[PDB]
mmCIF file of C-alpha atoms and ligand atoms in Angstrom:
data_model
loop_
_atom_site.group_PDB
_atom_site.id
_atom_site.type_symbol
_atom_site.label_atom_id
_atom_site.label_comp_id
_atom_site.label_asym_id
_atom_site.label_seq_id
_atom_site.Cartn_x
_atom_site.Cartn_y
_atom_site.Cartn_z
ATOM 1 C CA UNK R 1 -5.120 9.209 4.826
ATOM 2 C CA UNK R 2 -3.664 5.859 4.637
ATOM 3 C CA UNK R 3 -6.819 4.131 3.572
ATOM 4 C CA UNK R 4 -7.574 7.442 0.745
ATOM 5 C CA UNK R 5 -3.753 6.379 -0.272
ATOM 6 C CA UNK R 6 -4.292 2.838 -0.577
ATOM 7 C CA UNK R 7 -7.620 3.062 -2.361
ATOM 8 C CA UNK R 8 -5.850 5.289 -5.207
ATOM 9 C CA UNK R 9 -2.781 2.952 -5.129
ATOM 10 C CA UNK R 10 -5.496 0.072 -6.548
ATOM 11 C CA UNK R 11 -7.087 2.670 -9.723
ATOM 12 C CA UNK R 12 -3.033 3.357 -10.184
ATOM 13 C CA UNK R 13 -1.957 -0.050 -10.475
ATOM 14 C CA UNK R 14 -4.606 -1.513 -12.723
ATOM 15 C CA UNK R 15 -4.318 1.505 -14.867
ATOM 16 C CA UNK R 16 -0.824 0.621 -15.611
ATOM 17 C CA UNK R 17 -1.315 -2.649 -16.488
ATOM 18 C CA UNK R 18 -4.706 -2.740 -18.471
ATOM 19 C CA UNK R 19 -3.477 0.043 -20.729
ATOM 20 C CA UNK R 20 -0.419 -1.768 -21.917
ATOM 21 C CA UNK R 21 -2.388 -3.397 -24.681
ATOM 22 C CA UNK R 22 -5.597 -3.611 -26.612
ATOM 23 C CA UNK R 23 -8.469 -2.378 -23.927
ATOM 24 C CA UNK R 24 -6.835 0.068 -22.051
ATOM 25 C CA UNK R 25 -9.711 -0.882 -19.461
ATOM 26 C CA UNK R 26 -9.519 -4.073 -18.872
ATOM 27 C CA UNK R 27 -6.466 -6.485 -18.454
ATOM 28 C CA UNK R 28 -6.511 -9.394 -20.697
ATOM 29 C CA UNK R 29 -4.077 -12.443 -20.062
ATOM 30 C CA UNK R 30 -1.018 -11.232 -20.472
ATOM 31 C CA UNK R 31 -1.228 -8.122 -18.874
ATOM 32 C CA UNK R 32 -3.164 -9.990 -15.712
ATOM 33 C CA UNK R 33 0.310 -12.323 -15.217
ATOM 34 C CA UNK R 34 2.401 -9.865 -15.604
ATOM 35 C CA UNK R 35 0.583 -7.775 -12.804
ATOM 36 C CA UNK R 36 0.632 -10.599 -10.679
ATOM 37 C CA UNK R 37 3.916 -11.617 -10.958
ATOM 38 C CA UNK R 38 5.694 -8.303 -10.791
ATOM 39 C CA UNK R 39 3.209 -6.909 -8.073
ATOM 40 C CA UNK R 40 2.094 -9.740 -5.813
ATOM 41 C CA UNK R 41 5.634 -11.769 -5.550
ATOM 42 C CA UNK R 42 5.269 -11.548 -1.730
ATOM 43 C CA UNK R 43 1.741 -13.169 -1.438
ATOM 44 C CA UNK R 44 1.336 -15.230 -4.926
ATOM 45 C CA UNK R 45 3.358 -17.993 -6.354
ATOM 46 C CA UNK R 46 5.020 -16.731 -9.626
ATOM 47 C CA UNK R 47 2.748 -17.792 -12.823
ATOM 48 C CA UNK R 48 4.844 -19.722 -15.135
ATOM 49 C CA UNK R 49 2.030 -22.046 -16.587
ATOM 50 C CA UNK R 50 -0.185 -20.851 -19.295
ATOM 51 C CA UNK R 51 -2.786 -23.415 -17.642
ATOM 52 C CA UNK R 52 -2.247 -21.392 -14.542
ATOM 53 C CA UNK R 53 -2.995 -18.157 -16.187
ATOM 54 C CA UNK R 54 -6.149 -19.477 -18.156
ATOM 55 C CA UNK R 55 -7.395 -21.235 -14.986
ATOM 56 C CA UNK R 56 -6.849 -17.287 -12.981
ATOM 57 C CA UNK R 57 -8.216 -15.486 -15.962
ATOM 58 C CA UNK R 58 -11.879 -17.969 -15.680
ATOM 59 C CA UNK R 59 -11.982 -17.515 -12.159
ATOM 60 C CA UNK R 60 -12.146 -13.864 -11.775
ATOM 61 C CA UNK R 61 -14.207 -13.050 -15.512
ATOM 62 C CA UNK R 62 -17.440 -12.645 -14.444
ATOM 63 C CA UNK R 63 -18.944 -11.340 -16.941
ATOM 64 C CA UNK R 64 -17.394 -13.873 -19.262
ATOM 65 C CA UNK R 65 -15.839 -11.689 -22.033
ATOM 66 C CA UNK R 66 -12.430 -12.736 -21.315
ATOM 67 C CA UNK R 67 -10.733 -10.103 -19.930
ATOM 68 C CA UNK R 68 -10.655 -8.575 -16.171
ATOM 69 C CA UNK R 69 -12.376 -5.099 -15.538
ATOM 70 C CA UNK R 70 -12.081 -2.797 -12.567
ATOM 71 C CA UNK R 71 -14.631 -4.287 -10.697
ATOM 72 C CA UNK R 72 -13.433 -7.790 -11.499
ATOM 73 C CA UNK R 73 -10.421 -6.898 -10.361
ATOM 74 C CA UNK R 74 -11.621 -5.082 -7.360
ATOM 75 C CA UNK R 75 -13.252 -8.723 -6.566
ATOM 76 C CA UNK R 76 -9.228 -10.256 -6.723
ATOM 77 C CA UNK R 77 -8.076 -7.575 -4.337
ATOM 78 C CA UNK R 78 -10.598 -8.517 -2.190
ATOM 79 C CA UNK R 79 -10.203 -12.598 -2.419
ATOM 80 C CA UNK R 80 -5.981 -11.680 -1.727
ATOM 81 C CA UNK R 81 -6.543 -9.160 1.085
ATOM 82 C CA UNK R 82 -9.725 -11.549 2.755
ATOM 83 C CA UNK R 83 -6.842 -14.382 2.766
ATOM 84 C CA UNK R 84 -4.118 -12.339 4.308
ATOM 85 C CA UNK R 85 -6.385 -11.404 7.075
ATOM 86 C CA UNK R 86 -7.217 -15.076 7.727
ATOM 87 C CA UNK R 87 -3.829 -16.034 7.901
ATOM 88 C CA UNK R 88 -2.499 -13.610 10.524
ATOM 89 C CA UNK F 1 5.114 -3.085 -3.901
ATOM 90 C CA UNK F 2 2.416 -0.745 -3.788
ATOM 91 C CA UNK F 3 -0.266 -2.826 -4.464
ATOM 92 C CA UNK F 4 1.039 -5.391 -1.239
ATOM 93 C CA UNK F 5 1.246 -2.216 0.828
ATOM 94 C CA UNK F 6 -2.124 -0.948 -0.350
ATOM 95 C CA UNK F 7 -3.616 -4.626 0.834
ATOM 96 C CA UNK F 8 -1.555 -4.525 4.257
ATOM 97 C CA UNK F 9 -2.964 -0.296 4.323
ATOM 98 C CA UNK F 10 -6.510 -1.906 4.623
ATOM 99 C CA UNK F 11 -6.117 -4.361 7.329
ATOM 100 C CA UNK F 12 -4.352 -1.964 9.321
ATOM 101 C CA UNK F 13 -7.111 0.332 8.861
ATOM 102 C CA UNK F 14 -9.862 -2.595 9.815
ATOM 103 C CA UNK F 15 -8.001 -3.057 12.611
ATOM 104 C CA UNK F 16 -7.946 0.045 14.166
ATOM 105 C CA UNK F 17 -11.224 0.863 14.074
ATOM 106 C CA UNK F 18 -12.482 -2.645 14.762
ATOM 107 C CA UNK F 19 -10.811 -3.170 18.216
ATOM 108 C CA UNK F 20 -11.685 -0.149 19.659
ATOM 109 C CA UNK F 21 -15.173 -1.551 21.411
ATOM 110 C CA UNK F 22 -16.906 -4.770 21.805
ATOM 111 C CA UNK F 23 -15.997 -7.503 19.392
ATOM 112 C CA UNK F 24 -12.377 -6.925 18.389
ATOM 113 C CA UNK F 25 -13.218 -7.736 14.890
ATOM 114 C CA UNK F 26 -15.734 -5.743 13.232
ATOM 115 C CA UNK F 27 -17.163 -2.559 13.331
ATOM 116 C CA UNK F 28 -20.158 -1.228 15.624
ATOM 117 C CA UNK F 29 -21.648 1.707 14.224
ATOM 118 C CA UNK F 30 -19.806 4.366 16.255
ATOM 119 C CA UNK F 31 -16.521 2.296 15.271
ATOM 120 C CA UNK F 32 -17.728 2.715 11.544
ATOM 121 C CA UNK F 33 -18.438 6.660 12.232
ATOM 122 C CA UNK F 34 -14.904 7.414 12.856
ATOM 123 C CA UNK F 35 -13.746 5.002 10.117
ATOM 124 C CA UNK F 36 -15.426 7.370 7.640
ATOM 125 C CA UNK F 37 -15.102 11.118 9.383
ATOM 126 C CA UNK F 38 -11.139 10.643 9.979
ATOM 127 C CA UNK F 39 -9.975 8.671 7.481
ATOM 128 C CA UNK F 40 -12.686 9.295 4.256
ATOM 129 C CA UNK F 41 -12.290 13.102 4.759
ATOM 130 C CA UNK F 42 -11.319 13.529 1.225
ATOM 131 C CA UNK F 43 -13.996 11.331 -0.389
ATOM 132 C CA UNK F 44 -16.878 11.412 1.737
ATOM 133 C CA UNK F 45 -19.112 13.619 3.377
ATOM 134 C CA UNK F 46 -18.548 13.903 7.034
ATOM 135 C CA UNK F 47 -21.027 12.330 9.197
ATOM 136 C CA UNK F 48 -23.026 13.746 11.528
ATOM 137 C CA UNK F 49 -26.724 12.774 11.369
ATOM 138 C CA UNK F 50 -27.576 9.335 13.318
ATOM 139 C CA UNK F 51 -29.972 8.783 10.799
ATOM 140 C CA UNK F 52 -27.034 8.400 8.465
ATOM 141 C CA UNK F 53 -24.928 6.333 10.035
ATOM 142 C CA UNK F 54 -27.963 3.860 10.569
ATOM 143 C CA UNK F 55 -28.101 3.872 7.160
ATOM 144 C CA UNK F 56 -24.697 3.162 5.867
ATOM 145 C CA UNK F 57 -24.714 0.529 8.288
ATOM 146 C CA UNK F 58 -28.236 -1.484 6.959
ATOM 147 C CA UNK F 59 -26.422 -1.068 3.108
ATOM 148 C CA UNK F 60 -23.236 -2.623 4.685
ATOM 149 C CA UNK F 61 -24.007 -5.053 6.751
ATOM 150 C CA UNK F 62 -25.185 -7.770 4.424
ATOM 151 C CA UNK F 63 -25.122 -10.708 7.217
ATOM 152 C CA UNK F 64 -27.770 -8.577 9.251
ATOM 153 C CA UNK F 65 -25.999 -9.081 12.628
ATOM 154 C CA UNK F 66 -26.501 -5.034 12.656
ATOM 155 C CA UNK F 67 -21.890 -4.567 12.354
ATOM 156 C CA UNK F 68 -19.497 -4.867 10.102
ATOM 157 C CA UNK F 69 -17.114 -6.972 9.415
ATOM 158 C CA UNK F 70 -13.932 -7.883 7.186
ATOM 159 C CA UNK F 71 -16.092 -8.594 4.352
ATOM 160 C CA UNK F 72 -18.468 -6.494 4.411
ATOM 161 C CA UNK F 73 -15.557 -3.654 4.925
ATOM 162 C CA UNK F 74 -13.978 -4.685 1.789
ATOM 163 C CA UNK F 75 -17.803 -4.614 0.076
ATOM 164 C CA UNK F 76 -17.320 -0.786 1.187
ATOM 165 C CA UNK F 77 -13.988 -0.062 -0.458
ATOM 166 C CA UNK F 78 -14.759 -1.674 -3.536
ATOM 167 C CA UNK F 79 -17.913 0.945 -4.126
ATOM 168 C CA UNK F 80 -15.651 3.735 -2.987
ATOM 169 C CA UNK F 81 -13.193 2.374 -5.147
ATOM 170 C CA UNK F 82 -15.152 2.011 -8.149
ATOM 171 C CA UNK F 83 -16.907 5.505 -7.618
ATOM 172 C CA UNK F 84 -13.398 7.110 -7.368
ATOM 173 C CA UNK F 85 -12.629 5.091 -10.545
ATOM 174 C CA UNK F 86 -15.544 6.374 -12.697
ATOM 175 C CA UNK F 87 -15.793 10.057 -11.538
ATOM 176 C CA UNK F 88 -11.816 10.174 -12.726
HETATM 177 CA CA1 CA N 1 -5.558 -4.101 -21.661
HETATM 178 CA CA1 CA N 2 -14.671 -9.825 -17.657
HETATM 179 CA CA1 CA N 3 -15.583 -3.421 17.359
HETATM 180 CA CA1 CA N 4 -22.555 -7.881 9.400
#
């Protein structure tokens, strides 16, 4: 289905951003800018800022180790997708 | 991209299930039912027990207003999510 699609789009995109370098399971800063800038251009402002990164990076490590899991990440798809609904 | 198409996927989703009865923005249990037998076909069991919907429902529903809404949906795809993502 379309919701069994988009659920497997989310494991595929993190998965090719988290293993570009060091943890291949979680995405440290520069992976977690470049995902956002090549992947949510439509509903996030391009990051240019490393003070815009760092500030991203805090808000979503939970678990305070620096780098963004799967379910951290799960918690940004959920903050982007809870604000798209509220727009419309 | 796919990840802004996987976002817009689960609104549309939401949506059609939601409206169907009563409020026009979350899901009643029968609402919920169909959510999960005709689009979760691939990852979940089918439903057919009442007992079992009752009980997906009091693990959702977080707000105890006995439905689910937006939030609470995307509480749901983030477990199926993550279970997808560790079984694989
Ligand atoms: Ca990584
Ligand atoms: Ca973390
Ligand atoms: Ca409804
Ligand atoms: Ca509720």
């Amino acid at each position: 289905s379309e919701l069994e699609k988009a659920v497997v789009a989310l494991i595929d995109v993190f998965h090719q951003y988290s293993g570009r370098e060091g943890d291949k399971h979680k995405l440290k800063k520069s992976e977690l800018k470049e995902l956002i800038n090549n992947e949510l251009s439509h509903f996030l402002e391009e990051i240019k800022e490393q003070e815009v990164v760092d500030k991203v990076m805090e808000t979503l490590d939970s678990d305070g180790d620096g780098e963004c899991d799967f379910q951290e990440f799960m918690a940004f798809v959920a903050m982007i997708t809870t604000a798209c609904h509220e727009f419309f």
